[PDB]
């Protein structure tokens, strides 16, 4: 049973993205079927699927069940594929803050830091750290801080027995903390919302219309396009607020001086005054004036032959210029500037990667004296993947088997000292006389 459970969990973890694309395909099919609905009065309103074949309603029920199953197994596959990395990052950050800052020994988390208060629950658990590979965190913290804070107090803080320090001849709290970490993850919350809408789709089929919004999360090109909207989204919200304030000012002016022009009634038996109170006039200006092509002047009474004709003309013209022309141009310019800024950031990345080394920072003109010397330097001498593979080699090796250089780098790595990375120097630069 355990072997089959492990195989099922690994199969769901391996095919997570394929199941997400399958869910998107099923949602598209469901909405294509939903396009064939109609309303019948036989009062009581009935939603009937008009069809000349008689097959689309069992197909709709089958697709709803299939979509709910796929959403559930997508959540399960997410828990076995992406949750370990999130827990690994959180545990690593907790360990670094505990050892190199004294987060729960010397200092304390602020009242505005919910993460520190929640992570206080995990330090005394015996399972911590579970995904982080450094299993001597508590011993390091004890050895660092017991001289000035007492070994017994820190051992009680870190959930370590006094007899457990020497030889001396289901963890519920950790899982509660892990559930709290998982439930605050954005992708898990998105998948939980997706599954909730899939479950609600059986209560009413049109709840399957929300899943089409997954195209905003599934395709990289659409994410890049929507990044032009979310780049300056704060400025967009502030521009909409500024538009609301300006329209409120025009509403105040109209309610004080131009009330007679807001009769929207065809017949004189019953008027339809839109500006006899401030709330109705403000709603009218925000809903009718902004959407109108020429401003508020398109939708109110003609001001000709009136004592306030020139004031009304100035009112309409400044409403057209300030709101219709300028603020919408600010919105469009923010979107276009977002496009240009993203393109400039990508070009900056390209130029920085082409002009200097990522490790040592020496420019390509020094290396290019040798034919194709910078390509040789970035592919063989200071290759980033080689540094990743060396860290992977050092971690997966016994400390008693370390050589002198490996011990040197390992000791500097455990202290978070990155002076072993070459900075402004390389093998060619140091032995330039001997190699040349």
């Amino acid at each position: 049973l355990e072997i089959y459970q492990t195989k099922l969990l690994h199969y769901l973890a391996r095919n997570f993205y394929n199941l997400r694309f399958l869910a998107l395909f099923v949602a598209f099919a469901i909405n294509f079927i939903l396009l064939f609905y109609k309303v019948t009065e036989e009062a009581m309103v009935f939603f009937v699927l008009q069809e000349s074949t008689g097959y689309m309603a069992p197909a709709l029920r089958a697709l709803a069940i299939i979509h709910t199953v796929i959403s559930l197994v997508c959540v399960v596959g997410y828990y076995c594929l992406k949750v370990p990395l999130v827990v690994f990052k959180r545990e690593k950050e907790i360990a670094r803050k505990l050892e190199f800052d004294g987060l729960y020994i010397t200092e304390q988390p602020s009242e505005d830091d919910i993460k520190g208060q929640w992570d206080r629950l995990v330090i005394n658990t015996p399972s911590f750290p579970n995904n982080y590979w450094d299993k001597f965190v508590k011993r390091k913290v004890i050895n660092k801080y017991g001289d000035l804070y007492g070994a017994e107090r820190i051992a009680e803080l870190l959930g370590l027995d006094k007899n457990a320090l020497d030889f001396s001849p289901i963890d519920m709290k950790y899982h509660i903390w892990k559930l709290g970490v998982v439930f605050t993850d954005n992708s898990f919350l998105y998948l939980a919302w997706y599954t909730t809408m899939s479950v609600l789709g059986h209560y009413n089929n049109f709840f399957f219309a929300a899943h089409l919004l997954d195209i905003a999360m599934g395709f990289k090109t659409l994410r890049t396009i929507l990044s032009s909207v979310t780049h300056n989204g704060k400025q967009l919200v502030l521009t909409v607020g500024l538009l609301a304030v300006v329209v409120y000012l025009y509403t105040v002016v109209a309610f004080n001086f131009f009330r007679k022009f807001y009769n929207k009634s065809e017949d004189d038996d019953e008027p339809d005054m839109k500006c006899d109170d401030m709330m109705t006039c403000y709603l009218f200006h925000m809903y009718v004036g902004v959407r109108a092509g020429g401003g508020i002047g398109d939708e109110i009474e003609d001001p000709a032959g009136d004592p306030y004709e020139m004031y009304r003309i100035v009112f309409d013209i400044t409403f057209f210029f300030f709101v219709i022309v300028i603020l919408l141009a600010i919105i469009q310019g923010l979107i276009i500037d977002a496009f240009g800024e993203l393109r400039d950031q990508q070009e900056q990345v390209r130029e920085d990667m082409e002009t200097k080394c990522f490790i040592c920072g020496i420019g390509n003109d020094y290396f290019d004296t040798t034919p194709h010397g910078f390509e040789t330097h970035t592919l063989q001498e200071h290759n980033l993947a080689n540094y990743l593979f060396f860290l992977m080699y050092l971690i997966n090796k016994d400390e008693t088997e370390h050589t002198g250089q490996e011990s040197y780098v390992w000791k500097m790595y455990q202290e978070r000292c990155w002076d072993f990375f070459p900075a402004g120097d390389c093998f060619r630069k140091q032995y330039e006389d001997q190699l040349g």
Partner: protein
């Protein structure tokens, strides 16, 4: 600049060509205040998991973030954090 070694490496050409994928080189600043070259072993599973498209996308996202929004922090600290996260991801992908 040694010719006897070049006459010695000719029979080792096939052996040196076999281990070319598995032979990793880095350069460090050693304990003698000199640049040293470190030779180590790269496993084949590490090579296969490094060349996955998702790992490549993660690497290019890391380079983008370091170049653009990489200020107010040491670049090598961010690089080591990226390496640790990538190593964990690769090990998890090898497990499943």
């Amino acid at each position: 600049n040694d010719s006897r070694l070049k006459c010695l490496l000719d029979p080792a050409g096939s052996v040196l060509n076999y281990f070319e994928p598995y032979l990793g080189r880095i350069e460090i600043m050693g304990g003698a205040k000199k640049i040293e070259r470190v030779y180590f072993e790269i496993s084949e599973s590490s090579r296969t998991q490094w060349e996955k498209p998702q790992v490549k996308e993660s690497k290019r996202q890391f380079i983008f973030d370091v170049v653009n929004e990489g200020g107010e922090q040491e670049k090598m600290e961010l690089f080591v954090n990226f390496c640790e996260d990538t190593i964990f991801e690769m090990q998890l992908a090898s497990q499943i």
